[PDB]
C-alpha cells in the first residue's frame, strides 16, 4: 500500500513505553529523549538489531501533533436493506418474475468503469407472501453471489425476521429453506464483505454495490418492484490491515528500498505490527529550517503506533511521556 | 395490453392466446388461469 | 425608462412638505395574475391510473418585446393506482416548482402554490427545495400558478412582465383523448410596489431640468442625486399645464405612502 508523503514518513512501533537508555531491552520498545530546555526531541527506541534513535525534532519546529483512535481507522461495512415497495405491493403479484440486479463498481480493476453486475430472480406464486418473497429471493441471491468457487467474495445476505428485528439471520448457498422456518420477514439486507490483503503487495479496498430493480407488469403498469435503502452500520473492519501496510513502506524510508527484488539477494526487515491487532496512530509533523537563505523548510513527519485495548491504555500513556518531556499540549484520546 | 384476435368454439381448452367458447360460457386465459366471463 | 412624453414631464419629490389628479399607490401597483389549475370533474375527479398529466405554460415576451418571444415550460406527473386528488396537485406543484422555480434559472417566470381544502385563503409556496415530506396535508384541492416581479435596474431595465397561460395536454378516458383540466383566472392577491415605477420615472423626468448624457463617458460625468428610494411606495400627483398654439406642460409631484394617503393628502 503505497501512500502519499508531504516529505519523508518514518514510524516506530511502540510494544512497550520505558523511562530510561538502559532498559530498551525487546525489539519494540520505545522511550521519548529531550533535553532540560525542551528545545529537542527525538525517539530512542529498540530496533530488531540493537537500540536506534529517531530524527531530532526541533520543539519550535511543529506544526501539528494529534492522536488518532483505533475507531477511527476502522471501516464502517455498507449494508442495503431491500425491502418490497409499498406503493408499488406490498404482496407479491402472482405470475411476475422479480429479478434483482446488484451493481458492483470497483470490481477488479481499479476505476468506476470496471464494473460487474450479479441477478437473482423469483418467479412469485398465488400464495406467496411478503415473508416466502423474502426467504426465496434471499436463497437465490446467495445461490448466485455466495457460491464456493468465486474469485473473491462479493456481498453478505442477511434476513431479518421481524419478531426478532435487530439480529441478522445468515443465508449462504448451502442454506436450505428448510433451514429459515420464521414466517414474519420484512427485508434482505446485503452487506459488503472484506478483500482480501497481502501486506505491501495487496492493499485494504472495497467492491461498492448499489441494488437494482427489473420492472414487473403489476396493473397494466411496468413498475420497478423494490426500494434499497442503506441502514446504518454494524460492522467494521479493524484497523490491523492498515497499519502493516503503514509500517511496510515506511520501513524503507529507514531500512531497504530493495524488498525482495533479487530474492534471495536481499536485506529482510523485522516488522513489528501484527496485523491481527488493532493500533492508535500518533503524527508528529515537523519541519528543518536552515541557517541564513536555506529558510525552506523539508516538512516531515514521525508516525509512532501503539497496540490499544478497548480503553487507549498504551497510546495515552505514551502520549503522557512525550508530553512532559517535550513540554507539547498532544491531547489524550 | 394483451390483444386476442380469435374465438375458438371447443370442447377441449385452445391455446392461450385464444377465446374458449363451450355452448354459452365464454373464458379467456388471464394470469394462468382461464377465466370465466359472467 | 423612457415614457412618453406631452412635450415634457418634470418630476418633484415631495420627501418632507388642463387637469390636475392625484393617484394612489394602489393604482400602480400591478396586482400579479393567478390562475388556479384543477381536475375538471367532467373528465375524472380521480386521476386516471394510466396517465401521464403534462402541463404546459405558455408564456410570451420572454426576453424580448413581442408575443412572438414564446417559453414553454412543462410540468408532469404519471399518476398511479392509489393516487388521490390531493396526491396530485401535492406531486405536480412540486414538479412545477422544479422547472420554474429552481437555482438556475436566469429569471423568474411564475410563483407555485398549493390551496388546502382546511385554509382556502392561505396559500402555502412551493419551490424547488421544497420536499414531499413538507407538504403534509392530505386535502389540495388547487393549484394557484402566479405571476412574479422580474429583475429590475434603475433607467436601465424597465419594469416588465412575462405573461403566461397554463395549457393542458390530452389524457386518454375511456377510449377518447381529453383535457385534464381546467385554468381559472381568479382575483389576484398579491401586487408589485410602486417603487421601481417611480424610481425609473424619476430618473427619466429628472433629465428634463439637467444632465441628459447620464453616465457617457463616465469619468467626465455630471453626477445627479436621486431623491426617489426604491423600496417605498408613492402617491402621485399629475398637474398638466400648457402656455396662438398650446405647448402643453407636465408636473409629477411624488411622496411616501404610509398606507393612509398622508403627504399626498397634505399636498
Known sequence: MVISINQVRQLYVAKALKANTAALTTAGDIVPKADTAKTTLYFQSMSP????????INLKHVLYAKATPSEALAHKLVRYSVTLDADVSATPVAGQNYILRLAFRQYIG??????????????????????????????????????????????????????????????????????????????????????????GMMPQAFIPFTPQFLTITVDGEDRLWGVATVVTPTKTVPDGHLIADLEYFCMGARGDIYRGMG??????????????????????????????????????????????????????????????????????? | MKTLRTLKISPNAPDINSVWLYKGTMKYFNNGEWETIG
Open chain 1, 49 to 56: 538489531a540493537g537500540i536506534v534513535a529517531s530524527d531530532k
Open chain 1, 110 to 199: 481499479l476505476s468506476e468503469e470496471d464494473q460487474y453486475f450479479k441477478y437473482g430472480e423469483v418467479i412469485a406464486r398465488s400464495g406467496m407472501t411478503a415473508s416466502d418473497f423474502y426467504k426465496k429471493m434471499a436463497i437465490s441471491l446467495a445461490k448466485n453471489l455466495e457460491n464456493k468457487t468465486e474469485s473473491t467474495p462479493l456481498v453478505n445476505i442477511y434476513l431479518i425476521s421481524a419478531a426478532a428485528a435487530s439480529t441478522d439471520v445468515p443465508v449462504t448457498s448451502a442454506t436450505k429453506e428448510s433451514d429459515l422456518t420464521a414466517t414474519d420477514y420484512n427485508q434482505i439486507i446485503i452487506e459488503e464483505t472484506e478483500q482480501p490483503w497481502v501486506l
Open chain 1, 263 to 333: 530474492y534471495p539477494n536481499i536485506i529482510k526487515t523485522t516488522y513489528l505490527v501484527d496485523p491481527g491487532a488493532v493500533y492508535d496512530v500518533l503524527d508528529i509533523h515537523y519541519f528543518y529550517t536552515g541557517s541564513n537563505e536555506s529558510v525552506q523548510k523539508s516538512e516531515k513527519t514521525i508516525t509512532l503506533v501503539a497496540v490499544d485495548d478497548g480503553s487507549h491504555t498504551a497510546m495515552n500513556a505514551l502520549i503522557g511521556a512525550i508530553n512532559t518531556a517535550s513540554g507539547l499540549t498532544i491531547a489524550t484520546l
